[PDB]
Design a protein around this ligand. Structure first.
Ligand SMILES: *[C@@H]1O[C@H](CO)[C@@H](O[C@@H]2O[C@H](CO)[C@@H](O[C@@H]3O[C@H](CO)[C@@H](O)[C@H](O)[C@@H]3O)[C@H](O)[C@H]2NC(C)=O)[C@H](O)[C@H]1NC(C)=O
Ligand SMILES: *[C@@H]1O[C@H](CO)[C@@H](O[C@@H]2O[C@H](CO)[C@@H](O[C@@H]3O[C@H](CO)[C@@H](O)[C@H](O)[C@@H]3O)[C@H](O)[C@H]2NC(C)=O)[C@H](O)[C@H]1NC(C)=O
Ligand SMILES: *[C@@H]1O[C@H](CO)[C@@H](O[C@@H]2O[C@H](CO)[C@@H](O[C@@H]3O[C@H](CO)[C@@H](O)[C@H](O)[C@@H]3O)[C@H](O)[C@H]2NC(C)=O)[C@H](O)[C@H]1NC(C)=O
Ligand SMILES: CN(C)CC1CN([S@@](=O)(F)=Nc2cc(Cl)c(C(=O)N3CCO[C@@H](c4ccccc4)C3)c(Cl)c2)C1
Ligand SMILES: CN(C)CC1CN([S@@](=O)(F)=Nc2cc(Cl)c(C(=O)N3CCO[C@@H](c4ccccc4)C3)c(Cl)c2)C1
Ligand SMILES: CN(C)CC1CN([S@@](=O)(F)=Nc2cc(Cl)c(C(=O)N3CCO[C@@H](c4ccccc4)C3)c(Cl)c2)C1
Ligand SMILES: *[C@@H]1O[C@H](CO)[C@@H](O[C@@H]2O[C@H](CO)[C@@H](O)[C@H](O)[C@H]2NC(C)=O)[C@H](O)[C@H]1NC(C)=O
Ligand SMILES: *[C@@H]1O[C@H](CO)[C@@H](O[C@@H]2O[C@H](CO)[C@@H](O)[C@H](O)[C@H]2NC(C)=O)[C@H](O)[C@H]1NC(C)=O
Ligand SMILES: *[C@@H]1O[C@H](CO)[C@@H](O[C@@H]2O[C@H](CO)[C@@H](O)[C@H](O)[C@H]2NC(C)=O)[C@H](O)[C@H]1NC(C)=O
Ligand SMILES: *[C@@H]1O[C@H](CO)[C@@H](O[C@@H]2O[C@H](CO)[C@@H](O)[C@H](O)[C@H]2NC(C)=O)[C@H](O)[C@H]1NC(C)=O
Ligand SMILES: *[C@@H]1O[C@H](CO)[C@@H](O[C@@H]2O[C@H](CO)[C@@H](O)[C@H](O)[C@H]2NC(C)=O)[C@H](O)[C@H]1NC(C)=O
Ligand SMILES: *[C@@H]1O[C@H](CO)[C@@H](O[C@@H]2O[C@H](CO)[C@@H](O)[C@H](O)[C@H]2NC(C)=O)[C@H](O)[C@H]1NC(C)=O
Lengths: 171, 323, 323, 171, 323, 171
């Protein structure tokens, strides 16, 4: 994708993560598990829901549109009516197909952006208390229990608390 | 050591969309915007049943071709249904003047009252009213339009007639009449007694004089003669006057018209069911809030916009990579 | 220790825009593309004042209904203004043939010269020219169109008349005339003396013969008779010939037409002021370089494109977060 | 936003910075102050001005467009004229609304991109002579006077000049 | 120490495109979508040569104005070419009724057979067939339409004539005829002997009676008289009947029509060459798979969409920075 | 550009690199040379080829469209026909110009994204075995022969193999 996260440095998705589009997988002494990031997920749902509603909202209700009839001496008017009908149909078909292709491109890019932003947000919180090990994973230089894991997940990670232990481990 | 990973949802979804850069992209979640599904039935529109002309077309219905099942004296509809094999139309050959304009007028009509504008046994004294033709046959016997009357000579005379009707219905009244053009001068004398006959019709906003044209025409439905059909909309309060000394196919029944919005004429092979819709097409009713449809360009009511597209699916979720 | 920070502008701006992902986004800077403001006045267009028909409509103006304030003999305009209550129109009842086509013709007309094509006291010898009617009343007295002349029998005879005018104006000349249809044969003899009268009109590219139709019509403006109105555009250098032995409402005044671009007919309730614009609507003049407007679909001159939108505001600055 | 800078890792705007869309706030011994980045700001103004002018340029002048009249026996032609007028109005309204929504989205994303690019440009100039302290701020490991601050602001920062002092301070 | 760098392509390309943010951007690779190139020739369309009317217009061709080089008795075409200086049109002055509708009909015609519907020396006994006019001159001598016949009195009598043709061609047959309107009553008697002449024409779906109008008209091509021209399409199997006692310009040759798709009438100053195209314009043929063109809005065949754009170039490569 | 790589931190293009849009220039003991990245280049060509084909595909063939004629008493119908013809032409011209401008913007941004993603992919492979020296270049802290250069270019670089030598060199 445009931001290099989805089908990029993070090769694959998690079927194990069923509660949101984006989130975290952790492994520590206490065990392992997945948890969706509710904030980034909910924001994304609101945006995409607004985008879908906007597309539907712009196409106004169609009111009664029916054929007209013309006698053998009104061939020009018949062809004019057909020209008008065909012209409008050509335009709406063009508009519909192009809008969906563009919004689809923008949507996939939007998800890619959201995933990269979540990774960088985690990266900047952890700083040098962990190492980047590829595939969007961090390996801690200190012991990180479920409380520690929750502090990263909910954006309140305490760098100084583990800075000494991490420094010792990093050597 | 302990690890934490950032990742994204995958599932067993097989839905695909197209983008500008790429075709056939599998995504976790998406929404169809293109309605393709209908029930294949004719339904009511917002409570009101359609007017089914059945074996008749608009011309057959309004003239009252005997072959078509007589409709109630008062009717209302949300739209008008003709069928593709509308064989019962004009039964006596000739031209229907401004037929297409009359159809366009009827397309904004929501109801009618069929009423006796000129009672048969009173309206046309000293004239014959029994005139029938094999071109407009009913039950094997020669017959005639239920809404018109063939006036002919009586006891060898066709006295000049003059009649008027005053529109006290408080709605537009559609009046129809005909002008007969015999193929030769001997039929003209036999039928109307007067070689130099005329017909005049007059209202506040309508005036036209009709003169017959005698000539040997090709046989159509076994008739060398012709019948031209004319109409006008008599405004509320206005008077219509018919003056003639021959060749007049007199009005007998007329229609008090009510105007509606969102009506129209469609052609359909579909059958009426006890169902209700907001959107009717000639193939069937649509029950959808989707913005687009590829079912039919002809729509009655509140419908999705018709497009030629085979697929319109918007991605909502992510590129699906469950590997 | 010393610090440096990267950041972005904020201010007290309350302007909002919509995006695809989000509604009601507050931004630091933006531009309105949708013009909604007009002055509520009729103005000149690119220097040229409009033609105000006032109490008249196009039919009333060109026939010269006596009720309408006589305009100058020579005029030019950027557009034409009728009012919604154009009560003074056709004053003597009948049909105006190709009225809509004549309006369409006038929509590309930039000026006229009103001139005496057939001087009253010379043009029609041995005929009466004093004919008036209560249907076209002026100052309580029976009157007639200022541009037409009611020719009737004189001393019990209506001699066949034949007159032609040669167009040496070097511009198209619009000629108007009428055909009277009495309600009965006794009026016909009284007015024109000849039961079998005809009228003919001929130019290089126009030929039509008119025959009166006698019949008792419903009273309209207290008249059972009718008057049909006809027109043609006589090409520069061409000749128009009128031949008649009765029922002719003769041309008296005609119009030398100049063609323009960007003219049209509007209906407006607004009043003329001493102002100038590039863009006029029926509600008022627009003074704007903005690409869109939601004021009115009817435009004269160089106007923004009309749209139904309530708001069209483009963001230029940033998401405003002054917190 | 799409690039995670505006309303992202930089939470808020500066009402104090009145001379451009993007720029710098500094604190050193000599004092503190704001200064807009003229280069990135001017480039952004030119782009957005081109974008606005392009949108206006594409809508050609409307020339005289007025109603037509039809008699009681031209009802079909009247409805055809109405169909044409309504059809064109539907299309232009659709086109106008969609163009503004898309360009608005692209504009907000463009600003977000410009801000992130300015931060990364500063980051890459300073290297390890300063630490990332969040909220788009750097804290120097050396003394940085107004001349030093100007060299970063105008893109000529001299890493080797302060590399020793920074190394000493970083320990 | 050893180094590795990441970078992007540059070249000597000078191609430029526009974007939303920026104009005149130099890029390494791009594609033109706007076709501006044509060969300036008239070519065949999908194998079929066009019909070149040359000195004639549609009116001149179908009536058979003597000035126009007689085309083969049987022809087929992909489109129809008139020239801007089509001076040879209607040669005897008058009106061509429903000319524009007839052109619209011909626009869906793919071929014709010119055949003798009413052989000159057999079709009209006891009438003169030698009538010619200086208005339709050929080789300096007075002549007449090749497809019509001027019937006039013979030996001081014009007997009532009645003729019919039965359409056994298995295709629509286009029949043309005329009605002559002398300027005065003395010419009428001289030419047709009967002051009160009529003409009638009848088919299964056509009926019209024609009456001459005598009046002194302005001289056009030195003629004060007029000739009106009428046409109908006789359906396969149907019969056309002409009945007249004067003033009839009889059909002599008619056209068996074949219908096609994708035909039309264009005006062109270009010359026919031995070339073949899928797309023809009045300026020249286009040989292109490009989606857009700015050459001409008039197109025959399978053409790129016409637009007013001066340039439409899409970038494919990168911003070119070879510095 | 939107991603800050092209005409950004990488100032200029390489006329020397003729085999793809994106790739590598190396300098080691064995010599120097350019090599295009075939994977990122081919993917980009497929995308852009799909984008061009999509734009052409959406404009359906134009079939025969010719003038109509109207007599002196059909002026309204003539103007209606002209209104229809002019209306459709206005719309298609608007649609064509806007589609090309937007796709051009998206294309330049797409290339910028692809270049930045290739740089970050190299950056994350090398880690601290090399230093970022600006202008999209890395300087190795170890000896890197043509085999080493190929491993980075084809995405199989072996960090541990050179980690000791790099550490020694970085001091
Ligand atoms: C759009 O993408 C989907 C997803 O890849 C395509 O569906 C897939 O179609 C291929 C057809 O070659 C399937 O391959 C076959 O699989 C069977 C076993 O399931 C194997 O025995 C055959 O030898 C063959 O390789 C593939 O399974 C299938 N994938 C899924 C998930 O259904 C689809 O064809 C693409 N459409 C277009 C128009 O490109
Ligand atoms: C679009 O966004 C703007 C900005 O937030 C909205 O304006 C705001 O509207 C709310 C209405 O609930 C205002 O709240 C109220 O503030 C007063 C004091 O000013 C307080 O006493 C009330 O209890 C109430 O909370 C809010 O002040 C106001 N903000 C500004 C800056 O004017 C606007 O409503 C939004 N529009 C839509 C349609 O969502
Ligand atoms: C679009 O961009 C191109 C590329 O810059 C512009 O082309 C260039 O036009 C300028 C005109 O001022 C050329 O400058 C001149 O160069 C000659 C020597 O070649 C020098 O003697 C003159 O004093 C002058 O400076 C420039 O060479 C030329 N560049 C190339 C590569 O051809 C073009 O003008 C731009 N178009 C628009 C409408 O802005
Ligand atoms: C006019 N109406 C009837 C048309 C409908 C279409 N819209 S709607 O405005 F609901 N469109 C949608 C919007 C969204 Cl975010 C989604 C979507 O993608 N959803 C539903 C929310 O939850 C998401 C989710 C994420 C992660 C794990 C499981 C589920 C998946 C879907 Cl599947 C449709 C209204
Ligand atoms: C046809 N014409 C009359 C219509 C007008 C609309 N355009 S115009 O092409 F000027 N559009 C605009 C373009 C821009 Cl960059 C801006 C804008 O946003 N501006 C003005 C420049 O300075 C910016 C700024 C930045 C920071 C601190 C203070 C001020 C703020 C604005 Cl507010 C409008 C021409
Ligand atoms: C309907 N048809 C006839 C119209 C044509 C236009 N299309 S097409 O679908 F081929 N469009 C194009 C697509 C692309 Cl990727 C390119 C392009 O930009 N190319 C060609 C591939 O190689 C690229 C390249 C990269 C690096 C070094 C040298 C060359 C440069 C070009 Cl120059 C055109 C079909
Ligand atoms: C994020 O998670 C951490 C860890 O749970 C929260 O810190 C607190 O941790 C102690 C455990 O010693 C709990 O008793 C508290 O309940 C936690 N605080 C709260 C507010 O729940 C931290 O507060 C969390 N932050 C947010 C925003 O939820
Ligand atoms: C038309 O479509 C609506 C919307 O799907 C149908 O309403 C649903 O009916 C089913 C079963 O009766 C319910 O389980 C759904 O919850 C209903 N959906 C909503 C949104 O109300 C409706 O039955 C369809 N038919 C008609 C005649 O309206
Ligand atoms: C029409 O609008 C223009 C543009 O706003 C008006 O011109 C401005 O007039 C005011 C006061 O007279 C000046 O302070 C502005 O500087 C003018 N702007 C420009 C761009 O010239 C104009 O007065 C308005 N009215 C008319 C009749 O043109
Ligand atoms: C960026 O700012 C620095 C600091 O002012 C400039 O370096 C020079 O600094 C000395 C102070 O000892 C001044 O005397 C010079 O005038 C400065 N140079 C210049 C060109 O002004 C540096 O040059 C600046 N760079 C740019 C591009 O403006
Ligand atoms: C029409 O255009 C096509 C496409 O360019 C022409 O075909 C090419 O002709 C040249 C020389 O004859 C060849 O070198 C190209 O390889 C051909 N291209 C393709 C795609 O086949 C064609 O000659 C042109 N003229 C006609 C009458 O078709
Ligand atoms: C990427 O390049 C490296 C270096 O050439 C490949 O590693 C192998 O290197 C040895 C040299 O000692 C060669 O003999 C092998 O042929 C190389 N392997 C292969 C598969 O060619 C590495 O394999 C390359 N990877 C890819 C995906 O091409």
């Amino acid at each position: 994708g445009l931001f290099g996260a989805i089908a990029g440095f993070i090769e694959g998705g998690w079927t194990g993560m069923i509660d949101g589009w984006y989130g975290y997988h952790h492994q520590n002494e206490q065990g392992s598990g997945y948890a969706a990031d509710q904030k980034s997920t909910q924001n994304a749902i609101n945006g995409i829901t607004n985008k879908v509603n906007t597309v539907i909202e712009k196409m106004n209700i169609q009111f009664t549109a029916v054929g007209k009839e013309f006698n053998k001496l009104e061939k020009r008017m018949e062809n004019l009516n057909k020209k008008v009908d065909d012209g409008f149909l050509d335009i709406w078909t063009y508009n519909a197909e192009l809008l969906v292709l563009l919004e689809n491109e923008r949507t996939l890019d939007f998800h890619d952006s959201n995933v990269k932003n979540l990774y960088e947000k985690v990266k900047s919180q952890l700083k040098n208390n962990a190492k980047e090990i590829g595939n969007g994973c961090f390996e801690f230089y200190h012991k990180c229990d479920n409380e520690c894991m929750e502090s990263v997940r909910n954006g309140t990670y305490d760098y100084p608390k583990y800075s000494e232990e991490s420094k010792l481990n990093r050597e | 050591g302990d690890t934490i990973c950032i990742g994204y949802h995958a599932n067993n979804s097989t839905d695909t969309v197209d983008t500008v850069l790429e075709k056939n992209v599998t995504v976790t979640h998406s929404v169809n915007l293109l309605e393709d599904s209908h029930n294949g039935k004719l339904c009511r529109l917002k409570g009101i049943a359609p007017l089914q002309l059945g074996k008749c077309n608009i011309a057959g219905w309004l003239l009252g071709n005997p072959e078509c099942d007589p409709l109630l004296p008062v009717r209302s509809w949300s739209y008008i249904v003709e069928t593709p094999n509308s064989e019962n139309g004009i039964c006596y050959p000739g031209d229907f003047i401004d037929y297409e304009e009359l159809r366009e007028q009827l397309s904004s009509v929501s109801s009618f009252e069929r009423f006796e504008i000129f009672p048969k046994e009173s309206s046309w004294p000293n004239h014959n009213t029994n005139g029938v033709t094999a071109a407009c046959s009913h039950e094997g016997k020669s017959s005639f339009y239920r809404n018109l009357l063939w006036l002919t000579e009586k006891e060898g005379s066709y006295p000049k007639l003059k009649n008027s009707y005053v529109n006290k219905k408080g709605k537009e009244v559609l009046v129809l009449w005909g002008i007969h053009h015999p193929p030769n001068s001997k039929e003209q004398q036999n039928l109307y007694q007067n070689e130099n006959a005329y017909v005049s019709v007059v209202t506040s906003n309508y005036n036209r004089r009709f003169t017959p044209e005698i000539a040997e025409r090709p046989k159509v439905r076994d008739q060398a003669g012709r019948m031209n059909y004319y109409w006008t909309l008599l405004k509320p309060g206005d008077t219509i006057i018919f003056e003639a000394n021959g060749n007049l196919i007199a009005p007998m029944y007329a229609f008090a018209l009510s105007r509606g919005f969102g009506s129209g004429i469609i052609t359909s092979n579909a059958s009426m069911h006890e169902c209700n819709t907001k959107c009717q097409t000639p193939l069937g009713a649509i029950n959808s809030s989707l913005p687009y449809q590829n079912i039919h360009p002809v729509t009655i009511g509140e419908c999705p916009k018709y497009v030629r597209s085979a697929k319109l699916r918007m991605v909502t979720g992510l590129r699906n990579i469950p590997s």
